[PDB]
Design a protein around this ligand. Structure first.
Ligand SMILES: CCn1cc(CNC(=O)c2cccnc2)cn1
Length: 119
């Protein structure tokens, strides 16, 4: 029932994601010189360095907010892919499975702790 435990759990999960080879296309903001029309298709760019910086700045109040930004990285990859068989999109699918597998207990523990706090 530790209401704050999610933060270090998310830092550790981000560390695993950065070591994952599948995170390579998502570690920093998409380069507009590489993908010139990126902002014509994607309204809200997102990447793992921005998520980590937001977390470290104390600008996430809950793991649900972090999870919304991480899921945005994957939805942006899906929306920008010309085919569902592209290299970058295929990496986002595997990384999304890994992330969802690990974030599930973080979310459950946090929501349980908050329900206990407000009992
Ligand atoms: C990390 C950035 N990112 C790349 C993709 C896949 N998109 C392409 O390869 C592509 C190339 C040129 C025009 N349209 C699409 C998805 N997110």
């Amino acid at each position: 029932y530790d209401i704050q435990a999610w933060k270090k759990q998310c830092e550790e999960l981000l560390n695993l994601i950065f070591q994952c080879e599948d995170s390579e296309p998502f570690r920093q903001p998409v380069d507009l010189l590489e993908y010139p029309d990126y902002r014509d298709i994607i309204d809200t760019p997102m990447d793992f360095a921005t998520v980590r910086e937001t977390l470290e700045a104390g600008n996430y109040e809950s793991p649900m907010e972090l999870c919304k930004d991480v899921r945005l990285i994957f939805s942006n990859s899906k929306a920008y892919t010309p085919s569902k068989r592209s290299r970058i999109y295929s990496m986002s699918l595997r990384l999304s499975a890994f992330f969802e597998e690990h974030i599930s207990s973080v979310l459950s523990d946090y929501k349980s702790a908050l329900r206990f706090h407000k009992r």
